[PDB]
Coordinates of C-alpha atoms and ligand atoms in Angstrom, one line a residue:
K73 CA -12.0 -23.3 -20.5
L74 CA -11.9 -19.6 -19.7
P75 CA -14.9 -17.9 -18.1
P76 CA -17.3 -16.1 -20.5
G77 CA -16.9 -12.4 -21.3
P78 CA -17.2 -9.6 -23.9
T79 CA -16.3 -10.4 -27.5
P80 CA -12.7 -9.3 -28.2
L81 CA -11.9 -7.4 -31.4
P82 CA -8.7 -9.1 -32.8
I83 CA -5.4 -7.3 -31.7
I84 CA -6.7 -4.6 -29.4
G85 CA -9.0 -6.9 -27.4
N86 CA -11.7 -5.5 -25.1
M87 CA -9.6 -2.3 -24.7
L88 CA -12.4 -0.3 -26.3
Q89 CA -15.2 -1.5 -24.1
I90 CA -13.2 -0.4 -21.0
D91 CA -13.0 3.1 -19.4
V92 CA -9.2 3.3 -19.0
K93 CA -9.9 6.1 -16.5
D94 CA -12.4 4.5 -14.1
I95 CA -11.5 1.0 -15.2
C96 CA -13.3 -0.3 -12.2
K97 CA -16.7 0.9 -13.3
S98 CA -16.3 -1.1 -16.4
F99 CA -15.6 -4.4 -14.7
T100 CA -18.6 -3.7 -12.3
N101 CA -20.8 -3.3 -15.4
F102 CA -19.6 -6.6 -16.9
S103 CA -20.4 -8.5 -13.7
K104 CA -24.0 -7.4 -14.3
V105 CA -24.0 -9.2 -17.6
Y106 CA -21.5 -12.0 -17.1
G107 CA -21.8 -12.8 -13.4
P108 CA -19.1 -13.2 -10.6
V109 CA -16.2 -14.5 -12.7
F110 CA -15.6 -13.4 -16.2
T111 CA -12.7 -12.7 -18.6
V112 CA -11.6 -9.6 -20.5
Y113 CA -8.8 -9.1 -23.0
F114 CA -6.1 -6.4 -22.8
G115 CA -4.9 -6.8 -26.4
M116 CA -3.8 -10.4 -26.8
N117 CA -3.6 -11.0 -23.0
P118 CA -6.4 -12.6 -21.1
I119 CA -7.4 -11.3 -17.7
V120 CA -9.9 -13.1 -15.5
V121 CA -11.7 -10.8 -13.1
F122 CA -13.3 -12.0 -9.8
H123 CA -16.1 -9.7 -8.6
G124 CA -17.8 -10.2 -5.3
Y125 CA -17.0 -11.5 -1.8
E126 CA -17.8 -15.1 -2.7
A127 CA -15.6 -15.1 -5.8
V128 CA -12.8 -13.1 -4.3
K129 CA -12.8 -15.2 -1.2
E130 CA -13.0 -18.5 -3.1
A131 CA -10.1 -17.5 -5.3
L132 CA -7.7 -15.9 -2.8
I133 CA -8.5 -17.9 0.4
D134 CA -9.9 -21.3 -0.5
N135 CA -7.9 -21.8 -3.8
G136 CA -5.1 -19.7 -2.3
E137 CA -2.0 -21.7 -3.1
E138 CA -3.0 -21.7 -6.8
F139 CA -3.8 -18.0 -6.9
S140 CA -0.7 -16.9 -4.8
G141 CA 1.0 -16.0 -8.0
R142 CA 1.6 -12.5 -8.8
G143 CA 1.4 -10.4 -11.7
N144 CA 3.9 -9.5 -13.9
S145 CA 4.0 -7.4 -16.8
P146 CA 6.8 -6.4 -19.3
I147 CA 7.7 -3.2 -17.5
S148 CA 7.8 -4.5 -14.0
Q149 CA 9.9 -7.5 -15.0
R150 CA 12.3 -5.1 -16.6
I151 CA 12.5 -2.9 -13.5
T152 CA 12.8 -5.5 -10.7
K153 CA 14.2 -8.2 -13.0
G154 CA 12.2 -10.8 -11.0
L155 CA 13.9 -10.0 -7.6
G156 CA 12.5 -8.9 -4.3
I157 CA 9.0 -9.7 -2.9
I158 CA 6.4 -7.8 -4.9
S159 CA 7.7 -9.0 -8.2
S160 CA 9.4 -12.4 -7.4
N161 CA 7.7 -15.8 -7.7
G162 CA 8.0 -19.4 -6.5
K163 CA 10.9 -20.5 -4.2
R164 CA 12.3 -17.0 -4.4
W165 CA 9.1 -15.5 -3.1
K166 CA 8.4 -17.9 -0.3
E167 CA 12.0 -17.7 0.9
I168 CA 12.2 -13.9 0.8
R169 CA 8.7 -13.3 2.1
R170 CA 9.0 -15.5 5.2
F171 CA 12.2 -13.8 6.3
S172 CA 10.8 -10.4 5.6
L173 CA 7.7 -11.1 7.6
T174 CA 9.6 -12.3 10.7
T175 CA 12.0 -9.4 10.5
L176 CA 9.1 -7.0 10.2
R177 CA 7.6 -8.2 13.5
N178 CA 7.5 -5.4 16.2
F179 CA 10.6 -7.0 17.8
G180 CA 12.0 -8.7 14.7
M181 CA 14.8 -6.2 14.1
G182 CA 16.6 -6.1 17.5
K183 CA 16.4 -4.2 20.8
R184 CA 14.5 -1.2 19.2
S185 CA 10.9 -2.1 18.4
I186 CA 9.4 -1.0 15.1
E187 CA 6.7 0.8 17.2
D188 CA 9.3 2.9 18.9
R189 CA 10.5 4.0 15.4
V190 CA 7.0 5.0 14.3
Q191 CA 6.4 6.9 17.6
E192 CA 9.6 8.9 17.2
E193 CA 8.4 9.8 13.7
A194 CA 4.9 10.7 15.0
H195 CA 6.6 13.2 17.2
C196 CA 8.7 14.5 14.4
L197 CA 5.6 14.7 12.1
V198 CA 3.8 16.8 14.7
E199 CA 6.7 19.2 15.1
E200 CA 6.8 20.0 11.4
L201 CA 3.0 20.5 11.5
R202 CA 3.6 23.1 14.3
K203 CA 5.9 25.0 12.0
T204 CA 3.0 25.7 9.6
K205 CA 1.9 28.0 12.4
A206 CA -1.8 27.1 11.8
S207 CA -1.6 28.6 8.3
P208 CA -3.4 26.9 5.4
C209 CA -1.3 24.3 3.6
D210 CA -1.2 21.2 1.4
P211 CA -0.3 18.2 3.7
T212 CA 0.8 16.1 0.7
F213 CA 4.5 16.5 1.2
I214 CA 4.8 16.7 4.9
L215 CA 2.5 13.7 5.5
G216 CA 4.5 11.9 2.7
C217 CA 7.8 12.2 4.6
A218 CA 6.6 10.4 7.7
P219 CA 5.9 6.9 6.1
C220 CA 8.9 7.1 3.8
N221 CA 11.1 7.9 6.7
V222 CA 9.5 5.0 8.7
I223 CA 10.8 2.6 6.0
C224 CA 14.1 4.5 6.1
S225 CA 14.3 4.0 9.9
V226 CA 13.3 0.3 9.4
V227 CA 15.8 -0.3 6.6
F228 CA 18.8 1.9 7.6
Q229 CA 18.6 1.9 11.4
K230 CA 18.4 5.7 11.6
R231 CA 15.7 8.2 10.5
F232 CA 16.7 11.0 8.1
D233 CA 16.3 14.6 9.1
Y234 CA 13.5 16.0 6.9
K235 CA 16.2 18.4 5.5
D236 CA 18.9 15.9 4.7
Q237 CA 19.4 16.2 0.9
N238 CA 19.9 12.5 0.7
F239 CA 16.5 12.0 2.2
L240 CA 14.8 14.4 -0.2
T241 CA 16.2 13.2 -3.6
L242 CA 15.6 9.6 -2.5
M243 CA 12.0 10.4 -1.5
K244 CA 11.2 12.5 -4.6
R245 CA 12.7 9.7 -6.7
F246 CA 10.2 7.1 -5.4
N247 CA 7.4 9.6 -5.7
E248 CA 8.3 10.1 -9.3
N249 CA 8.3 6.5 -10.4
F250 CA 5.1 5.9 -8.4
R251 CA 3.4 8.8 -10.1
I252 CA 4.5 7.6 -13.5
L253 CA 3.8 3.8 -13.0
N254 CA 0.4 4.9 -11.8
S255 CA -0.4 6.4 -15.1
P256 CA -3.2 4.8 -17.3
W257 CA -0.6 4.8 -20.1
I258 CA 1.3 2.0 -18.3
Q259 CA -1.8 -0.1 -18.6
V260 CA -1.6 0.2 -22.4
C261 CA 2.2 -0.1 -22.7
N262 CA 2.2 -3.4 -20.9
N263 CA -0.3 -5.0 -23.3
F264 CA 1.3 -3.3 -26.3
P265 CA 5.1 -3.3 -25.6
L266 CA 5.7 -1.3 -28.7
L267 CA 4.3 1.9 -27.3
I268 CA 7.2 2.2 -24.8
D269 CA 9.0 3.8 -27.9
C270 CA 6.6 6.7 -27.8
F271 CA 7.8 7.8 -24.3
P272 CA 11.6 7.9 -24.4
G273 CA 11.7 10.7 -21.8
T274 CA 9.4 9.0 -19.3
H275 CA 11.0 5.6 -20.0
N276 CA 14.5 7.2 -19.4
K277 CA 13.4 8.9 -16.2
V278 CA 12.1 5.6 -14.7
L279 CA 15.3 3.7 -15.6
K280 CA 17.6 6.5 -14.3
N281 CA 15.4 6.8 -11.2
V282 CA 15.8 3.0 -10.6
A283 CA 19.5 2.9 -11.3
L284 CA 20.4 5.6 -8.8
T285 CA 18.1 4.2 -6.1
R286 CA 19.5 0.7 -6.5
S287 CA 23.0 2.1 -6.7
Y288 CA 22.4 4.1 -3.6
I289 CA 21.1 1.1 -1.6
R290 CA 24.2 -0.9 -2.6
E291 CA 26.6 1.6 -1.0
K292 CA 24.3 1.8 2.0
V293 CA 24.4 -2.0 2.2
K294 CA 28.2 -2.1 2.2
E295 CA 28.6 0.5 5.0
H296 CA 26.5 -1.8 7.2
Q297 CA 28.7 -4.8 6.5
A298 CA 31.9 -3.0 7.6
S299 CA 30.1 -2.3 10.9
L300 CA 28.2 -5.6 11.3
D301 CA 27.9 -6.7 14.9
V302 CA 26.2 -10.1 14.3
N303 CA 25.4 -10.5 18.0
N304 CA 22.7 -7.9 17.9
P305 CA 21.4 -6.5 14.6
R306 CA 20.4 -2.9 14.1
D307 CA 17.9 -3.1 11.3
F308 CA 16.4 -5.0 8.3
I309 CA 19.8 -4.7 6.5
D310 CA 21.8 -6.4 9.2
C311 CA 19.2 -9.2 9.6
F312 CA 19.4 -10.0 5.9
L313 CA 23.2 -9.8 5.9
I314 CA 23.3 -12.3 8.8
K315 CA 21.0 -14.6 6.8
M316 CA 23.4 -14.4 3.8
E317 CA 26.3 -15.5 6.1
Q318 CA 25.0 -19.0 6.8
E319 CA 24.4 -19.5 3.0
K320 CA 28.1 -19.8 2.6
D321 CA 27.3 -23.3 1.2
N322 CA 23.8 -23.1 -0.6
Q323 CA 24.6 -21.1 -3.8
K324 CA 21.2 -20.9 -5.0
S325 CA 19.8 -19.5 -1.8
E326 CA 18.0 -16.3 -2.6
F327 CA 19.8 -14.6 0.3
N328 CA 22.4 -12.7 -1.7
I329 CA 23.2 -9.0 -2.4
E330 CA 21.1 -8.9 -5.6
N331 CA 18.0 -9.8 -3.6
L332 CA 18.8 -7.7 -0.6
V333 CA 18.8 -4.4 -2.5
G334 CA 15.7 -5.4 -4.5
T335 CA 13.8 -6.5 -1.3
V336 CA 14.7 -3.2 0.3
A337 CA 13.5 -1.1 -2.6
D338 CA 10.3 -3.1 -2.4
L339 CA 9.7 -1.9 1.2
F340 CA 10.0 1.6 -0.1
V341 CA 7.8 1.1 -3.2
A342 CA 5.0 -0.7 -1.3
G343 CA 5.1 0.9 2.1
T344 CA 5.6 4.6 1.3
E345 CA 3.1 6.1 -1.2
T346 CA 0.4 3.8 0.0
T347 CA 0.3 4.9 3.7
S348 CA 0.9 8.4 2.5
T349 CA -2.2 8.4 0.4
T350 CA -4.2 7.0 3.3
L351 CA -3.1 9.4 6.0
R352 CA -3.8 12.0 3.3
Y353 CA -7.3 10.6 2.6
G354 CA -7.7 10.1 6.4
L355 CA -7.2 13.7 7.4
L356 CA -9.4 14.8 4.6
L357 CA -12.2 12.7 5.9
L358 CA -11.6 13.8 9.5
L359 CA -11.6 17.5 8.3
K360 CA -14.9 16.9 6.5
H361 CA -16.3 15.1 9.5
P362 CA -15.8 17.2 12.7
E363 CA -18.2 15.2 14.8
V364 CA -16.2 12.1 14.0
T365 CA -12.9 13.8 14.7
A366 CA -14.3 15.1 18.0
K367 CA -15.2 11.5 19.2
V368 CA -11.7 10.3 18.2
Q369 CA -10.3 13.2 20.1
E370 CA -12.6 12.3 23.0
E371 CA -11.3 8.7 23.1
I372 CA -7.7 9.9 22.9
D373 CA -8.1 12.1 25.9
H374 CA -9.7 9.4 28.0
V375 CA -7.5 6.5 27.2
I376 CA -4.2 8.3 26.5
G377 CA -4.3 11.7 28.0
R378 CA -2.6 14.9 26.9
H379 CA 0.9 14.0 27.9
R380 CA 2.1 10.5 26.7
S381 CA 2.4 9.5 23.1
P382 CA -0.2 7.0 21.7
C383 CA 1.0 3.4 21.3
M384 CA -0.5 0.3 19.8
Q385 CA -1.9 -1.0 23.1
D386 CA -4.4 1.8 23.2
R387 CA -6.1 0.5 20.1
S388 CA -7.8 -2.3 22.0
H389 CA -9.3 0.4 24.3
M390 CA -10.4 2.8 21.6
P391 CA -13.1 1.0 19.5
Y392 CA -14.3 4.1 17.8
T393 CA -10.9 5.1 16.7
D394 CA -10.3 1.6 15.4
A395 CA -13.5 1.9 13.3
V396 CA -12.5 5.3 11.9
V397 CA -9.2 4.0 10.7
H398 CA -10.9 0.9 9.3
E399 CA -13.6 3.0 7.6
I400 CA -10.8 5.3 6.3
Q401 CA -9.1 2.4 4.5
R402 CA -12.5 1.0 3.3
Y403 CA -13.8 4.4 1.9
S404 CA -10.3 5.2 0.7
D405 CA -10.3 2.1 -1.5
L406 CA -6.7 2.6 -2.1
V407 CA -6.2 -0.2 -4.7
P408 CA -9.6 -0.8 -6.3
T409 CA -8.6 -3.7 -8.5
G410 CA -6.0 -5.1 -6.1
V411 CA -2.6 -5.9 -7.5
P412 CA -2.6 -8.3 -10.5
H413 CA -2.0 -11.9 -9.6
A414 CA -1.4 -15.1 -11.7
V415 CA -2.2 -18.8 -11.2
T416 CA 0.7 -21.2 -10.4
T417 CA -0.6 -24.1 -12.5
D418 CA -3.7 -24.8 -14.7
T419 CA -6.4 -24.2 -12.2
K420 CA -10.1 -25.1 -12.0
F421 CA -12.5 -22.6 -10.7
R422 CA -16.2 -23.7 -10.5
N423 CA -16.8 -25.0 -14.0
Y424 CA -13.8 -23.2 -15.5
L425 CA -10.1 -23.8 -16.2
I426 CA -7.4 -21.1 -16.0
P427 CA -4.2 -22.0 -17.7
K428 CA -1.0 -21.6 -15.6
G429 CA 0.2 -18.0 -15.8
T430 CA -3.1 -16.3 -16.6
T431 CA -3.5 -12.7 -15.2
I432 CA -5.8 -12.6 -12.2
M433 CA -7.7 -9.5 -11.0
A434 CA -9.4 -9.8 -7.6
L435 CA -11.7 -6.9 -7.3
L436 CA -11.1 -5.5 -3.8
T437 CA -13.5 -2.6 -4.4
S438 CA -16.4 -5.0 -4.8
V439 CA -15.7 -6.6 -1.4
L440 CA -15.2 -3.3 0.4
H441 CA -18.2 -1.7 -1.2
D442 CA -20.6 -4.6 -0.6
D443 CA -24.2 -3.4 -0.4
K444 CA -25.2 -5.7 2.5
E445 CA -22.1 -5.9 4.7
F446 CA -21.9 -2.1 4.8
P447 CA -25.3 -0.5 4.1
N448 CA -24.9 2.7 1.9
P449 CA -21.2 1.7 1.2
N450 CA -20.5 5.0 -0.6
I451 CA -20.7 7.3 2.4
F452 CA -18.0 7.6 5.1
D453 CA -19.4 6.3 8.4
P454 CA -17.5 4.6 11.2
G455 CA -20.7 2.7 12.1
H456 CA -19.9 0.2 9.4
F457 CA -17.4 -1.2 11.9
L458 CA -19.4 -0.8 15.1
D459 CA -22.1 -2.8 16.9
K460 CA -25.2 -1.4 18.6
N461 CA -23.1 -1.0 21.8
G462 CA -20.3 1.0 20.3
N463 CA -17.9 -2.0 20.3
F464 CA -15.6 -2.7 17.4
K465 CA -17.2 -5.0 14.8
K466 CA -14.6 -6.9 12.7
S467 CA -15.5 -7.6 9.1
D468 CA -14.6 -10.5 6.9
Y469 CA -15.1 -8.1 4.0
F470 CA -12.3 -5.9 5.2
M471 CA -9.9 -6.4 2.4
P472 CA -8.0 -3.2 1.8
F473 CA -4.8 -5.2 2.0
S474 CA -6.1 -8.1 -0.1
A475 CA -6.6 -11.6 1.3
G476 CA -4.9 -15.0 1.1
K477 CA -1.3 -16.0 0.7
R478 CA -0.2 -12.7 -0.9
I479 CA -1.7 -10.4 1.7
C480 CA 0.2 -7.2 2.4
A481 CA 3.6 -8.0 3.9
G482 CA 3.4 -4.8 5.9
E483 CA -0.1 -5.1 7.2
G484 CA 1.1 -4.7 10.8
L485 CA 3.4 -1.8 9.9
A486 CA 0.7 -0.1 7.8
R487 CA -2.1 -0.3 10.4
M488 CA 0.5 0.8 13.0
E489 CA 1.5 3.9 10.9
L490 CA -2.2 4.8 10.3
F491 CA -3.2 4.5 13.9
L492 CA -0.2 6.1 15.5
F493 CA 0.1 9.0 13.0
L494 CA -3.5 9.9 12.9
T495 CA -4.0 9.6 16.7
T496 CA -0.9 11.6 17.6
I497 CA -1.9 14.2 15.0
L498 CA -5.4 14.6 16.4
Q499 CA -4.0 14.6 20.0
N500 CA -2.1 17.8 19.2
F501 CA -4.3 19.7 16.8
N502 CA -7.7 20.5 15.5
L503 CA -8.6 20.6 11.8
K504 CA -9.9 23.8 10.3
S505 CA -10.8 24.1 6.6
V506 CA -9.9 27.0 4.3
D507 CA -13.7 27.2 3.5
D508 CA -17.1 25.7 4.4
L509 CA -17.2 21.9 4.7
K510 CA -20.1 21.8 2.3
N511 CA -17.7 23.1 -0.2
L512 CA -15.5 20.0 0.5
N513 CA -16.0 16.9 -1.6
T514 CA -14.5 13.6 -0.5
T515 CA -15.0 11.9 -3.9
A516 CA -11.8 10.3 -5.3
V517 CA -10.1 10.4 -8.6
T518 CA -9.3 6.9 -9.9
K519 CA -7.3 7.8 -12.9
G520 CA -5.1 4.8 -12.3
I521 CA -4.3 1.6 -10.3
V522 CA -4.1 3.6 -7.1
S523 CA -7.1 5.9 -6.5
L524 CA -6.2 9.3 -5.0
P525 CA -8.0 11.8 -2.7
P526 CA -8.6 15.3 -4.2
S527 CA -6.3 18.2 -3.6
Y528 CA -7.1 20.0 -0.4
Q529 CA -5.9 22.7 2.0
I530 CA -6.0 22.1 5.7
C531 CA -5.1 24.2 8.8
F532 CA -3.5 22.5 11.8
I533 CA -4.7 24.4 14.9
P534 CA -3.0 23.2 18.1
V535 CA -5.0 23.8 21.3
Ligands
HEM673 C1 -2.3 1.7 4.2 C2 -1.1 1.0 3.7 C3 -1.0 -0.1 2.8 C4 -1.9 -0.7 2.0 C5 -3.4 -0.3 1.7 C6 -1.2 -1.8 1.3 C7 -1.8 -2.6 0.4 C8 -1.2 -3.7 -0.3 C9 -1.8 -4.5 -1.2 C10 -3.3 -4.3 -1.7 C11 -0.9 -5.4 -1.6 C12 -1.1 -6.6 -2.7 C13 -1.6 -7.9 -2.1 C14 -1.9 -8.9 -3.2 O1 -1.1 -9.7 -3.7 O2 -3.1 -9.0 -3.6 C15 0.2 -5.1 -0.9 C16 1.5 -5.8 -1.0 C17 2.6 -5.6 -0.3 N1 2.8 -4.6 0.6 FE1 1.4 -3.2 1.2 N2 0.0 -1.9 1.8 C18 0.2 -0.9 2.7 C19 1.4 -0.7 3.3 C20 2.6 -1.4 3.2 C21 3.7 -1.1 4.0 C22 3.8 0.0 5.0 C23 4.7 -2.0 3.6 C24 6.0 -2.2 4.0 C25 6.6 -3.3 4.6 C26 4.0 -2.8 2.6 C27 4.6 -3.9 1.9 C28 4.0 -4.7 1.0 C29 4.7 -5.7 0.4 C30 6.1 -6.1 0.6 C31 3.8 -6.3 -0.5 C32 4.1 -7.5 -1.5 C33 3.7 -8.9 -0.8 C34 3.9 -10.2 -1.6 O3 3.8 -10.2 -2.9 O4 4.2 -11.2 -1.1 N3 2.8 -2.4 2.4 N4 0.0 -4.1 -0.1
PLM674 C1 -0.4 25.3 -20.2 C2 0.3 24.3 -21.2 C3 0.5 23.0 -20.5 C4 1.2 22.0 -21.4 C5 0.3 20.8 -21.7 C6 1.0 19.9 -22.6 C7 0.2 18.7 -23.0 C8 0.9 17.7 -23.9 C9 1.9 17.0 -23.1 C10 2.7 16.0 -23.9 C11 3.7 15.4 -23.0 C12 4.6 14.4 -23.7 C13 5.1 13.4 -22.6 C14 6.3 12.7 -23.2 C15 6.8 11.7 -22.2 C16 8.1 10.9 -22.8 O1 8.7 11.4 -23.7 O2 8.3 9.8 -22.2

């Protein structure tokens, strides 16, 4: 039996009781009428929503294996064709994921640590910021390049020069699909597959954007094979190629070319625009909160100095900086509804039964914005992650990366990118606004699955 919920009108479902824009405000309202777990209908498709720490925890952690599905829609299945990590399921998923996770360990790619790659990029990021000569600017693009190049460095064993035309079309391609797939219209075309017919241009752009990206990665994969020194791998590409080698027999093992390309594109789709939006939302909060930025700057000076680049080891000695990054991700609420999951078999959830393959929506926003764990959860305040002695206070409610079996495969890489970029940036500049701070609003715009920070101009003042 499915959990209770609003009464569905026949073919459209609950689609009229939901605010397609702030779709998370609607769910929150239902929880007030139907409790922790409830069910809504997107057309003829059922979606069971889990709202609250208890529910979210129970579902993703405790009954994890059953909820370690993943959500797939008409569109995404068409794009990825079931390959990779994000979209794949079952034996394909576990097989790929595990390899990816080990390869994505700081020293899981060879002699050159992932950290070293980020650091190089942190320096490069800083240099481009110098070139703005302290003039006002929109950090969207520049900040965007850093993360995307990180994945590039991690996937192709060499960063791109911010001006390489190959780096730019590739990056603007991922930024396009992201932008499109983050449109509320995809949330209506997935539940009504006929509407795809009304967007031939958009539809065409996405398919052409996917074709050229895959097609590019293929060539890129081949030029790594013809220079493959199996003794010591260079990057994620070599590592996967070596794995494919010992599958000479297997011929079902998911370690083939078709999965390689797909898994790579997944590192780009999941690890680029996400970090980008957070560094973006991060600077904006640091800009709006000078006192906070000072203290971070005060810790950087003490623990790191004004000469060496910041590294991950400094984090354990910079409690306040840790809490700023944490509070950045929390406030940020990047993915409010989390990514859609699905149950592996018919599952029982406290008095209810969810048939194998039902769409699962764990509400991350509800955990992160918990009234008691973080008093006054709507205001930015690093104190949510600090104890009365200024020490870092870890939270079980810290779920910006989701929880359970399907937790972000790049959690390490993401937190690394956020800490290193932001600290290095603050180490070299001060943040001046193109107006008063009181004229600066940090309220997000959630016109989609990924909430975005508002457009803003910032001045990087080195001192
Ligand atoms: C601030 C940065 C990031 C945030 C907030 C974030 C968040 C998330 C979230 C919420 C999910 C879905 C988890 C679920 O199933 O419920 C996810 C999945 C994933 N992320 Fe990230 N992510 C970030 C960065 C990255 C980076 C840099 C990479 C690159 C390696 C990455 C790779 C992935 C992958 C591969 C998945 C799919 C995992 C699976 O289905 O098994 N993420 N991320
Ligand atoms: C100042 C004028 C701005 C123009 C505003 C235009 C608003 C209508 C836009 C309609 C866009 C149609 C999108 C079609 C996409 C597709 O074919 O896939």
